[PDB]
Design a protein around this nucleic acid. Sequence first.
DNA 1: CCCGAAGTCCG
DNA 2: CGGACTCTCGGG
Length: 231
Amino acid sequence: VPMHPFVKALQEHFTAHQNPEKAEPMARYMKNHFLFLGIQTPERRQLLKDIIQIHTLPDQKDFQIIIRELWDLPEREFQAAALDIMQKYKKHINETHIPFLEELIVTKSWWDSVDSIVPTFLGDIFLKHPELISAYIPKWIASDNIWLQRAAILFQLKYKQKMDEELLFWIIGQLHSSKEFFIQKAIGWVLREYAKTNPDVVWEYVQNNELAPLSKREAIKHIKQNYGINN
DNA sequence: CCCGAAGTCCG
DNA sequence: CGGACTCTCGGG
Ligand SMILES: Cn1cnc2nc(N)[nH]c(=O)c21
């Protein structure tokens, strides 16, 4: 069975605007885990828009099919476009899509794709269905996959006043001993971001619980100005 | 326009 | 370790 024609059209149009000179630094920035065509986001978005204008967005029955097919293409721009396309189907994504989203997190994994899946798509699902958190988060923390561990940390990133503080700190406690940069940094990020809503709670947590040095420093990068740096 | 959110390079 | 800095991207 051939590639979906929308994907074939997108592949043709992206490839015709590839930039091998830019592709080399773009691939190096992702530590050469991926081939790149060399197309940056403003142009990539317009090229996708060109294809939607010509072909129309596929019927929602094909949404997951399109995403998978783009995920399986070698160049990283096709995963970025896949995430752009998934946003166009946002109103059709619900709690039944958590396994589909998990599979995207653990395939072609790196911070660029995972961070575009977790605080937005999964974050919105678990805000609406917080009773489903315990069906996934414990497994993610226990898994060998650092990107599911990062998902457990960052899905609440944007929750602000809806943050479940007890849950957040329990998750961080489970992962505070990790030597993985992407876990230590995710802990620092979510704490730094939540400190924009509740600085006192974050300050108390980082002063009284063990964290990797990187995590602590990133957490208080801004709020240390409010409290001071004791001699 | 601005600001705040991986990477290199150095001590 | 962490400071100083780069570029790209999203949002105000
Ligand atoms: C702070 N920060 C986090 N991710 C970032 N990505 C880029 N490209 N540039 C930054 O300054 C940056």
